[PDB]
Design a protein around this ligand. Structure first.
Ligand SMILES: CN[C@H]1CN(c2cccc(OC)c2)S(=O)(=O)c2sc(S(N)(=O)=O)cc21
Ligand SMILES: [Hg+2]
Ligand SMILES: [Zn+2]
Length: 257
């Protein structure tokens, strides 16, 4: 299937997912100078106090920590959103080197990695339905920069040994996603899509201005994951990020000046 190799990378995805050349694709470059500061923008409402993590699994593209989205346990409201978006999973996109990994860039600047807390609009019933609507999903993107260790991230770093290869998973309960959030909830927002196939344009992107810092050894562990499954030639999971797409007839609105 698709991937990030020269033969099945982002530059080949259109052949199987024509929407790859659609009108509102992500990621995009966030030009801070021409992004319109919108004052009618309400503040974000992140309520992860009842968040219930279930497991973490390597899916061949990255590891995901899934959450029990059966009830309004961890939701995102406010900001550019209308309705309540329920958290279902979060993942990261990172690179082989420190100066690459984030999918979104700020003024062309790339970050070591990018965290995406994926939510789905509950007014649609289930997830599979939300992905059939232009406002079905809300992804909170957070930039990770190398520096001091992010305490709340270490719990995830420790478990990466038991899910080295594709298909593996492990119980990962009682994880508090709030330990991965920056101090400020200031953001940028625009309408976009998933950054991986099927590349659906159902996402309202909220990219926080403030990045979190993770240590070198922390992100280093990410790079030890395997794209491949057990018993197959080792293929390091690194650079599982998509390049920026044309903004086209879209504008980025900041919730700050
Ligand atoms: C591969 N995982 C991706 C697709 N996913 C997915 C899973 C099940 C069904 C489905 O479409 C019917 C899509 S997903 O919506 O959860 C996400 S969010 C996301 S990102 N990087 O833009 O935040 C990439 C993916
Ligand atoms: Hg959609
Ligand atoms: Zn992602």
């Amino acid at each position: 299937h698709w991937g990030y190799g020269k033969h099945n990378g982002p530059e080949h995805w259109h052949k199987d997912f024509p929407i790859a050349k659609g009108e509102r694709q992500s990621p995009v470059d966030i030009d801070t100078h021409t992004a319109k500061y919108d004052p009618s923008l309400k503040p974000l409402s992140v309520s992860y106090d009842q968040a219930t993590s279930l497991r973490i699994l390597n899916n061949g593209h990255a590891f995901n920590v899934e959450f029990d989205d059966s009830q309004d346990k961890a939701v995102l409201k406010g900001g550019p959103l209308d309705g309540t978006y329920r958290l279902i999973q979060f993942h990261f996109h990172w690179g082989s080197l420190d100066g690459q990994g984030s999918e979104h860039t700020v003024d062309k600047k790339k970050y070591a990695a990018e965290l995406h807390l994926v939510h789905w609009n509950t007014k649609y019933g289930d997830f599979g339905k939300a992905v059939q609507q232009p406002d079905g999903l809300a992804v909170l993107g957070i930039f990770l920069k190398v520096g001091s260790a992010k305490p709340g991230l270490q719990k995830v770093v420790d478990v990466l040994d038991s899910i080295k290869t594709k298909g593996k998973s492990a119980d990962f309960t009682n994880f508090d996603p709030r330990g991965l959030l920056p101090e400020s909830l200031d953001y940028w927002t625009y309408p976009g899509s998933l950054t991986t196939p099927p590349l659906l344009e159902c996402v309202t992107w909220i990219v926080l201005k403030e990045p979190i810092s993770v240590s070198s050894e922390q992100v280093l562990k990410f790079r030890k994951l395997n794209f491949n499954g057990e018993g197959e030639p080792e293929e390091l999971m690194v650079d599982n990020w998509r390049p920026a797409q044309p903004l086209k007839n879209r504008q980025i609105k900041a919730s700050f000046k």
